[PDB]
Design a protein around this ligand. Structure first.
Ligand SMILES: C[C@H](O)CCCC(=O)CCC/C=C/c1cc(O)cc(O)c1C(=O)O
Ligand SMILES: C[C@H](O)CCCC(=O)CCC/C=C/c1cc(O)cc(O)c1C(=O)O
Ligand SMILES: [K+]
Ligand SMILES: [K+]
Lengths: 266, 266
């Protein structure tokens, strides 16, 4: 496993990790921007003959050295532009990409905006609606935000509380700092930026969409409807919002099998 | 409200209830066949200018006096034929119908099989897949089945434990007796009878489909995909499998608004 940093001319100094040799697979974090959530799965995926790259997101975790514009008023299109910049810097010319949540919005924006660069995209639980209870956290003090959101993650959406806790002290210390950055920068601007206003733009694209099997139906009901309208492959992963944390082996297998499916079609 | 019994030529003695004056709305129970679950909603719906009819299902609750054929090897098409028989007996020529679970399968079979008789159908959480853990209960002793399924209803699918328990001792005593009848007669034969093989047969039909907002996505994921493929209205009700129990006011409002929509479209 390579663990290193790289600076892109948009002002971001990224923390990134890479393992393996073969076709490129890129794992984009969810909104919390913390790539140690992929630790187990990176090794499992790489062992099947892929070069796997992941990174902390701008302003989050070890990628905190970044201009304010990269972690405020954040949109899918902004994040896609940042991910392309690190792929450029790492000389990754063609990639399979995974993303959940804001990361899902990001990888759909990548596929649509950079079709020559993206082999296929896997998106999971893509937020398309403003949720006032999340948006309203942006006006609380930092410690309040961290307390509230740490609880929501553990108890409401982790899909596996033991696995979530087992991320460890250092990871949760980084997440503690990320929660206010995410709250102030993401929930009011990510959902309106969802690249799903044109179902016909999605039709025929190499997109595989998932929702968590245990997620309440309401939460990403809209994803299932939109994917089906567009004729996009739509299915389920175990758990809820963090399948790479709750079920890392199943997650790794899904990423490998999906990449292999598109390498055959390619 | 009328509370009475009526016998049909097929050998069933039905317990039925009826309240109100106006266009007919018929509430078909779920597999447990117990129409007291509609008690609150019947009055709320009737008060908006509808004649509302409901009944216990054959072999269940107060409609137990019925031939074994009617509660063994049960299919959507069998249940639809039985519901038509009581509508005939009650001189209900045109009806709006609601059904959940096996009742959902029933109302779609009614709409497709008897289009002259059905104004519109509301289906909720329609089972299309065999579930071994439910099917396998059919070989257990009666009291084992009742204990197991009572627990599943309360803890896994009620969508409101307080409301579920508040059905009261009389209702739960009837359900306790129904669980083995349901287990032996329904889960092995109801899902393969689902009238959803042909999406094109559903297209353009006056069908409104719902799933519970809190239901785990995996439970009726297939409903959302099928409805969307067929261009059928698909949406959510609060709770899980029994919105008429957990949220009777919202349930009543949905039934009234949906019936009104189709009366206009008529
Ligand atoms: C991990 C995740 O990305 C950030 C933590 C929040 C969470 O898990 C709540 C459940 C999923 C909703 C996300 C979401 C919802 C919104 O209404 C707006 C958003 O921008 C996100 C967003 O940016 O992802
Ligand atoms: C209320 C319900 O009608 C009967 C009680 C069981 C329950 O609530 C499990 C959750 C929903 C699955 C139903 C279901 C599932 C199957 O695999 C087969 C069925 O025939 C039903 C069936 O007959 O409905
Ligand atoms: K696993
Ligand atoms: K209610």
């Amino acid at each position: 496993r390579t663990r290193s940093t790289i600076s892109t001319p948009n002002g971001i100094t990224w923390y990134y990790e890479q393992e393996g040799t073969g076709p490129d697979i890129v794992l984009v974090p969810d909104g919390l921007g913390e790539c140690q959530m992929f630790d187990s799965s990176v090794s499992q995926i790489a062992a099947q003959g892929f070069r796997v790259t992941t990174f902390d997101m701008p302003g989050m975790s070890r990628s905190a050295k970044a201009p304010a514009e990269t972690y405020t008023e954040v949109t899918a299109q902004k994040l896609a532009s940042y991910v392309i910049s690190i792929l450029d810097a790492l000389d990754i010319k063609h990639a399979t990409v995974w993303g959940c949540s804001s990361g899902a919005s990001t990888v759909v924006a990548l596929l649509l905006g950079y079709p020559d660069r993206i082999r296929n995209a896997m998106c999971h639980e893509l937020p398309t609606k403003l949720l006032d209870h999340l948006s309203n956290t942006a006006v609380l003090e930092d410690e309040e935000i961290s307390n509230i959101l740490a609880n929501v993650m553990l108890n409401d959406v982790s899909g596996g509380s033991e696995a979530w806790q087992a991320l460890g002290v250092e990871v949760h210390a980084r997440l503690h700092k990320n929660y206010p950055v995410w709250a102030r920068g993401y929930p009011r601007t990510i959902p309106p930026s969802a690249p799903v206003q044109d179902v016909e733009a999605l039709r025929g694209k190499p997109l595989d969409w998932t929702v968590g099997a245990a997620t309440p139906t309401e939460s990403f009901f809209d994803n299932i409807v939109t994917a089906t309208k567009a004729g996009v492959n739509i299915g389920l992963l175990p758990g809820m919002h963090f399948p790479y944390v709750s079920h890392p082996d199943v997650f790794a297998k899904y990423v490998v099998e999906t990449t292999q499916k598109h390498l055959w079609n390619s």
